[PDB]
C-alpha cells in the first residue's frame with residue numbers, strides 16, 4: 511500500500527540521513543515558495559499508525575488543521591516535512607518513532623515505538 515511505496519521509493523528528508531522521515535510528492539504544488547519557521551500553516555491530512563488501526567483525519571472535524579511551523583506544536587517529522595512542501599502540494603510521509611512520539615509514545619492514543627504514516631495537503635501558509 512501507500513506506506514510500503516514510501517519505504518520503497520520515498521526521499522529521505524532528514525538532516526542526519528537516517529531515513530527517519532521519508533516523503534513522496536503525490537500532487538505537485540504551485541509556485542516555488544515553501545514555508546519558513548514561524549509561518550502560520552493550513553493543511554488537511556489523514557494519519558494512521560503504520561501497522562494497525564488508529565486512523566485520524568482533519569476532514570473529520572470539518573476544517574483545516576492549523577499550526578505555526580517549527581514552533582513546538584507538532585511532531586518533529588511535521589516541522590521537517592511540511593517545510594519542504596508548496597501551496598497546493600499533496601505528500602505522503604512515513605515516520606520512524608524518533609521523529610514522532612519516541613520510546614515513550616503518547617498513551618493511550620499512541621504506543622511506544624510507533625511508526626506513523628500521513629497524507630498531507632498544504633492548503634496555505636501566511637507570515638507571522
Ligand SMILES: COc1cc2cc(OC)c1OCCOC[C@@H](C)OC(=O)[C@@H]1CCCCN1C(=O)[C@H]2C1CCCCC1
Nearest residue numbers: 557558559564565566575583584585588616619620626
Ligand atoms: C498525540 O495526540 C494526537 C495525535 C494526533 C491527533 C490528535 O488529535 C487530533 C492528537 O491529540 C491532540 C494532540 O495534538 C496532536 C499533535 C501533537 O499532533 C501531531 O503532531 C501530529 C501531526 C499533526 C496532526 C496530528 N498528529 C498526530 O500524530 C495524530 C495521530 C496520527 C496517527 C493516528 C493517531 C493520531
